[PDB]
Nucleic acid binder design. Sequence first.
DNA 1: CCCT
DNA 2: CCCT
Lengths: 218, 218
Amino acid sequence: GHMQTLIFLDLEATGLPSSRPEVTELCLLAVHRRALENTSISQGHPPPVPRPPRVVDKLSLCIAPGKACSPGASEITGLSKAELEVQGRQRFDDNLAILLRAFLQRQPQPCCLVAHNGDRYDFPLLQTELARLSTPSPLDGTFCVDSIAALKALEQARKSYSLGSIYTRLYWQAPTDSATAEGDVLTLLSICQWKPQALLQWVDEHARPFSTVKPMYG
Amino acid sequence: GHMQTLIFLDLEATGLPSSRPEVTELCLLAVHRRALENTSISQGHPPPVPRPPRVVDKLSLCIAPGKACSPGASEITGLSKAELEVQGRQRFDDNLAILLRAFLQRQPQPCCLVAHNGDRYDFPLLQTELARLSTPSPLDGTFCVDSIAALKALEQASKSYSLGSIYTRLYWQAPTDSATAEGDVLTLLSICQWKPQALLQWVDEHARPFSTVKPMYG
DNA sequence: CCCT
DNA sequence: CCCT
């Protein structure tokens, strides 16, 4: 009934939902409630990009997909199944689920996941990948929330609500290292640090369990 | 008999070995053999700072120590037991050992740890922290190597061997984000990317099992 | 002599 | 219309 740790999440995959994609890279960035509360309210025209908090748990992993990547997805991310296999990256396996659960348990509960276009992409895909695994879902007790829905509410308080479009609106800069699991998570964090205590309170009242998120396929 | 994944490691602690320290933060950065082999040989006067490889697994975690930090250690790292406790960071517990083991198992074996002044600080301390845990050591099958010994051999080939002193010698820049588990690991990676295929071959011939590393105390 |  |  109150979120103690916001886990900023983003995945890079082989393609769009219509292509039945598989995760090629993921990145989680755990940050405590009071880490965000202790952050500068973005003032000035333009305001500076807020510094990430000091105490922050992070996990960036590369994953070998079972199928090839599309030319458009390969170019922007700069990844391919051939390259991931040659560097010995393992599949989305049961070992990965253990690694997530161990990482999650360190974070003070209740934790809420945060992903841009998460309710329509990052969560259903992650749920579908966890559906393949014989082990139970490690994100069972955790909550989730789409940052697009959050920023729409905050900013109305008349168009593109993309990750890159929001970041450039707020701070008037190009995102650093686009098309990388970590780079997009860091960009998402910066957006959420715009009005953090306002964002936190919205997440509390609109956060839902990850188990309620229906999968992409299967 | 041949290292497939170099895991760049560094810890931030409550103090020097003489003070019997405890880990306040750690960061692992796994990179495949071929990732380093596919890297620019640093040419030009001065040479540019090499780009980190694309496919790279990373894990940065904050840990609550059982004892207070020294004023000198607190200032440089910008951390304290009071702040770590208030943000709900757990102790160096059995859960952490599982998280390391799960992370390690993803990396193609045999993997070798790399830490600056590791044989005298980062490895013995990590061994002492793992000695407290009731579970077995997750770094059992892994190897290790001190980057100081590596760079001494490479640089004498064709005085101060600190992490900051080496980085400034090679590229003529100040390290980005000093006194942070991740920032020091990224600095170490850059140093090792100076002559990577030469560094790799030295690590092979001087890499030893982590279990041979005697602990700092206990 | 180097890590914190 | 947004994620890759």
